[PDB]
Design a protein around this ligand. Structure first.
Ligand code: NA
Length: 4
């Protein structure tokens, strides 16, 4: 998971 990548959130930016
Ligand atoms: Na990912």
């Amino acid at each position: 998971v990548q959130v930016g």
